[PDB]
Structure formats: structure tokens, C-alpha cells
Design a protein around this ligand. Structure first.
Ligand code: QCR
Length: 309
């Protein structure tokens, strides 16, 4: 289900982010000279000749091209010339981690709890398609509007065979602080280790983007986990939200909740959000509406199109 397009049909407008793996641009799809110009995000591979880097972005593209759900990001297209470029939905905002750090002062309990529900729904969808994401984290959730988020960043995701429970991973670099103990010790990943990561992701959100285990080095993490230490109760959480988090980090992976249970439990809480999260100044916090997000987008496109002239 890869739609392979010509590189010449895309103009890059602006850089939205860059890391060691590559660059994300805001681009325009221009298939007909000057008559159609449609905004898109383009992720471009830096190391065009590296077989390992090509492997990684193509695996990402494959997983991303086989998903279709409102709480999950999908691949619109690919270009395969001298390098690889993934063509993706352009969001007005970046990742949720950056979002919660920047907009801390106006984020209320209803938003935090809707985000929990939406990520669980997105993960439930992925589990139903046999996908183990293996890198769920607040930095890997995108903001489409403040009311609507989506799971992305499928570079590490694996498609389990029918009825198979586990993915046994090779060696390499891994995000220790989001991983289940069995993943650290034995390199085993499942939907229930994805549940462990989900609990860390909730904890990032409830702390408005604190780094987990801040101070403790990565190589110390499995030791402290085996000793029974876990991420601390965020200040805004009542015990009922923190217990859900703590259930996600139990040693027995089958004693962890399921994504479907997490959708039901967070839905219930979202029905009366201020009982479950205690935020000061909750009732007078303003976040942009969906129509504001379109305004912001039209505004940004106006100045960027003036810049290209
Ligand atoms: C201010 N606007 C923006 N800013 N940053 C990003 C990235 C850098 C998070 C954006 C990303 C996107 N669109 C998509 C859609 C689906 N997947 C992504 N990727 C997934 C893989 C990651 O490598 C990153 F490219 C985020 N981006 N739209 C807008 C962005």
C-alpha cells in the first residue's frame, strides 16, 4: 500500500525539525505546474546511502502505510530517488511532549484525560492489527488540534504473526526509561510491554513533560525496577489515576491492564475530570479550538508563502 510518487511533485517550504536520523519539512504537493498546492509534512532520510538507515525508514513507512484510524498517523506517500522521503499529514502543532511543556499554564483536567483516552484508543487499534509499537512516548504523539492527538513514529514497530505473543529483539540502542523490565532484561516485547510504555507516557503528560527517572542513569534502571521503585505520583493526580499508572508497571505483564480496559477507565474519569485531576485555576483555562487551529494554520501559510516569493 505504498504510493510511490515523483520527488519533483514536492517543494520544501520550511524546516519543522531535524535530528540525527533526518529532517522534517513543511512542503507543498504541486502535481500540476501552479494550479494545485497542498500542504504536507515530509520526513527526509539524511544518510541516503546507509543500508541500515534505509532499512529503518522503509520499515517505518511499511508499518505507517498499513494503519488507518483517527488516533494513529498514516503514510500518505513515499519518494524513492537518491534518498527516501515519507509524505505525511501536516499538523499545526508538533509533538504532545513539547506541547505540554509549552502550554502548561492553560492545560486543564478534561484535556489531559481526553488525551489518555485517545492514546489508549490508538493503541487498542494497533494491538487489534497485531502491531507492537515498541516506542510509545509523549514525544511520539502528535497534536493535530488541542482536542485531537495521534500516535506516530513507527520506526521500531513490529507486526506479530497470528496468535504469536512475543517479539524477540536483536541488540541495539533502546529507550530504557519507557521499557518494561522484561524488555530490558530479555529483549521481549508484547502488547503488555506497550502497556508499560503507555503508563510512562501518561506520567509525562500528568507532570507536563518531566523526564522520567530524572537523575538516575540508564544503566541503573533495571536494578531500581527489580527493587520495586517506580515513577512518583504527579502533584495533580488523585490516587485513582496513579493506581492505573502503577498497574501498568507491574512485574507480571498479564497483571497489567489492557488497552480496552484503559479506554473504559479513562473515559469514566473524563466524564468528571476535576474529581480525578486537581489543577489550580482549572475552570478558567483557554486552549485554541479546532477552528482556531485552522486560523493559526492559515496565518502561518500566509507568511511562509510570502517568504518563498
Ligand atoms: C509545527 N508543525 C510540526 N512540527 N513538527 C513536526 C515533527 C518534527 C514532530 C511535525 C510533524 C507533522 N506531521 C507528521 C505526521 C506523521 N508523522 C510525523 N512524524 C513521525 C516520525 C518522526 O520522525 C517525525 F517526523 C514526526 N509527522 N506535522 C507538523 C509538524
Amino acid at each position: 500500500l505504498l504510493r510511490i510518487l515523483k520527488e519533483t511533485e514536492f517543494k520544501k517550504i520550511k524546516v519543522l525539525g531535524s535530528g540525527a536520523f533526518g529532517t522534517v519539512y513543511k512542503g507543498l504537493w504541486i502535481p500540476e505546474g501552479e494550479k494545485v498546492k497542498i500542504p504536507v509534512a515530509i520526513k527526509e532520510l539524511r544518510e541516503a546511502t546507509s543500508p541500515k538507515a534505509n532499512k529503518e525508514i522503509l520499515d517505518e513507512a511499511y508499518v505507517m502505510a498499513s494503519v488507518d484510524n483517527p488516533h494513529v498517523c498514516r503514510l500518505l506517500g513515499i519518494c524513492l530517488t537518491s534518498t527516501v522521503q515519507l509524505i505525511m499529514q501536516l499538523m499545526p502543532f508538533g509533538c504532545l511532549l513539547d506541547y505540554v511543556r509549552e502550554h502548561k499554564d492553560n492545560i486543564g483536567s478534561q484535556y489531559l484525560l481526553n488525551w489518555c483516552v485517545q492514546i489508549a484508543k490508538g493503541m487498542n487499534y494497533l494491538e487489534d492489527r497485531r502491531l507492537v509499537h515498541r516506542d510509545l512516548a509523549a514525544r511520539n504523539v502528535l497534536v493535530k488540534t488541542p482536542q485531537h492527538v495521534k500516535i506516530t513514529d513507527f520506526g521500531r514497530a513490529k507486526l506479530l504473526g497470528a496468535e504469536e505473543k512475543e517479539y524477540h529483539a536483536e541488540g541495539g540502542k533502546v529507550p530504557i526509561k519507557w521499557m518494561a523490565l522484561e524488555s530490558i532484561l530479555h529483549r521481549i516485547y508484547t502488547h503488555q510491554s506497550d502497556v508499560w510504555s503507555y503508563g510512562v507516557t501518561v506520567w509525562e503528560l500528568m507532570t507536563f513533560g518531566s523526564k522520567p527517572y530524572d537523575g538516575i542513569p540508564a544503566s541503573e534502571i533495571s536494578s531500581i525496577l527489580e527493587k520495586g521503585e517506580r515513577l512518583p505520583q504527579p502533584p495533580i493526580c488523585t490516587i485513582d489515576v496513579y493506581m492505573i499508572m502503577r498497574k501498568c508497571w507491574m512485574i507480571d505483564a498479564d497483571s497489567r491492564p489492557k488497552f480496552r480496559e484503559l479506554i473504559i477507565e479513562f473515559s469514566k474519569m473524563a466524564r468528571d475530570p476535576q474529581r480525578y485531576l486537581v489543577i489550580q485555576g482549572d475552570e478558567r483555562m483557554h486552549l485554541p479550538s479546532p477552528t482556531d487551529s485552522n486560523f493559526y494554520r492559515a496565518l502561518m501559510d500566509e507568511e511562509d508563502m510570502d517568504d518563498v516569493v
